[PDB]
Amino acid sequence: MTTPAERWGIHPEHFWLYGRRPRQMVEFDEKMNAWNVYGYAEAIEVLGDPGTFSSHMSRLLFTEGDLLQTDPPDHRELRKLVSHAFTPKVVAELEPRITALTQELLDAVADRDTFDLMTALAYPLPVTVVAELLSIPSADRHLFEGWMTEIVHSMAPMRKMLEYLREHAAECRRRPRGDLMGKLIEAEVDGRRLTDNHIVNFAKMLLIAGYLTTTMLIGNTVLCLDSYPEQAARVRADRSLIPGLLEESMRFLSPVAATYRATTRDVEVAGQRLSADQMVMVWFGAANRDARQFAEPELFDMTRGPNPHLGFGRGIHFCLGGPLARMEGRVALDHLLDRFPELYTDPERPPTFMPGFDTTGVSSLPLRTS
Numbered sequence: 001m002t003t004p005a006e007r008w009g010i011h012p013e014h015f016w017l018y019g020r021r022p023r024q025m026v027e028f029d030e031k032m033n034a035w036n037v038y039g040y041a042e043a044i045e046v047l048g049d050p051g052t053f054s055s056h057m058s059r060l061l062f063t064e065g066d067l068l069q070t071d072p073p074d075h076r077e078l079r080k081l082v083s084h085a086f087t088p089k090v091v092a093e094l095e096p097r098i099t100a101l102t103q104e105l106l107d108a109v110a111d112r113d114t115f116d117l118m119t120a121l122a123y124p125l126p127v128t129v130v131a132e133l134l135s136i137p138s139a140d141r142h143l144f145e146g147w148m149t150e151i152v153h154s155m156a157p158m159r160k161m162l163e164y165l166r167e168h169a170a171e172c173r174r175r176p177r178g179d180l181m182g183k184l185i186e187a188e189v190d191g192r193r194l195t196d197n198h199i200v201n202f203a204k205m206l207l208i209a210g211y212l213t214t215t216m217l218i219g220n221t222v223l224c225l226d227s228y229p230e231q232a233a234r235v236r237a238d239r240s241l242i243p244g245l246l247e248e249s250m251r252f253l254s255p256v257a258a259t260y261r262a263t264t265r266d267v268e269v270a271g272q273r274l275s276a277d278q279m280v281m282v283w284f285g286a287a288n289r290d291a292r293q294f295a296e297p298e299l300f301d302m303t304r305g306p307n308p309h310l311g312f313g314r315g316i317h318f319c320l321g322g323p324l325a326r327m328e329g330r331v332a333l334d335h336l337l338d339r340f341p342e343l344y345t346d347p348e349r350p351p352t353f354m355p356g357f358d359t360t361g362v363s364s365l366p367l368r369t370s
């Protein structure tokens with residue numbers, strides 16, 4: 001069966017998408033001036049040692065409040081403080097709103113013969129969750145819909161969004177409430193109250209981290225359903241397969257193909273000697289194709305497994321929006337299949353993908369009913 005990668009030429013440089021093995025699981029590149037980690041076990045080792053493999057990228061050369069760029073102990077405190085807003089409890093509380101939105105979005109395309117799934121369902125979806133968590137007024141949510149689209153399209157839309165979030169942080173200081181913003185106002189990291197800049201960077205981080213990759217998740221999954229008809233038929237007849245389907249979609253096409261790490265000391269990984277102050281690229285996409293961990297990794301199999309892929313990552317930085325992303329993917333797919341009995345890709349209007357080399361996901365997906 002022809003994979004999505006072979007059908008449309010998804011990231012030809014991503015050799016693992018075409019069943020090709022890396023010569024070594026840890027390889028240095030002179031052109032990139034960075035170490036590449038391709039193996040599953042080696043990835044877990046790198047991700048499991050944040051003291052050696054820092055997340056603070058500025059070391060190799062503003063980021064305060066941004067969890068992605070923060071190491072322990074500051075990371076430990078800041079994550080612990082915001083953890084409550086990402087639990088399965090918050091997932092269940094937000095589901096009816098996202099369900100309603102999914103219905104509304106699919107009402108618009110219900111009678112269409114052709115439609116782009118990305119612009120119809122995938123793009124106008126993920127903002128709502130983050131907007132709810134950041135207590136963005138419902139009237140200002142359209143602004144974030146526009147801003148996030150522009151940044152995806154390509155500095156100017158980012159400037160306006162940061163400008164809004166600065167005043168939003170100052171407004172929430174005048175309005176005390178038991179939400180995520182309110183807890184950030186009363187928060188203490190390193191024995192110090194977080195300034196507006198800390199909260200702005202956190203808000204910016206959350207918006208970026210909760211948008212494009214969720215969009216890629218929706219796109220990639222439908223792309224996989226179109227490539228595997230026998231498996232897609234089982235999904236329509238058994239909707240309880242959807243959670244497993246989404247997990248495999250992330251293994252097969254990891255929206256975040258790689259994350260970045262920086263060495264703090266001389267370290268040996270898989271016999272390779274890494275020097276201090278060097279960039280390390282941890283390829284989630286490559287690690288998800290490791291046959292030492294996954295049986296027949298070249299095959300798409302929704303029935304895995306359990307499926308311990310690295311699409312959400314691994315370690316202390318493990319995706320906080322993990323539970324929220326799976327839910328958003330589930331609701332989007334379930335209702336999409338309910339509304340459209342038949343969905344097909346168009347050879348005349350082929351799907352396009354994000355150019356980013358550290359990503360693997362759909363940018364546009366034209367669909368037809370017959």
Ligand code: HEM
Binds near residue numbers: 205214318
């Ligand atoms: C399917 C879509 C998604 C993908 C591909 C994805 C990818 C990731 C990955 C791989 C990490 C770990 C990063 C690392 O180790 O360096 C992560 C953490 C994070 N994610 Fe998820 N994610 C997704 C959904 C979300 C959602 C729904 C949110 C929230 C709205 C979110 C916001 C974050 C934030 C703020 C972090 C940083 C947490 C930390 O550093 O402790 N991402 N995202």
Ligand SMILES: [Mg+2]
Binds near residue numbers: 064
């Ligand atoms: Mg910095």
Ligand SMILES: [Mg+2]
Binds near residue numbers: 062
């Ligand atoms: Mg700086």
Ligand SMILES: [Mg+2]
Binds near residue numbers: 001227228229231232
């Ligand atoms: Mg099949």
Ligand SMILES: [Mg+2]
Binds near residue numbers: 091323326327
């Ligand atoms: Mg769920």
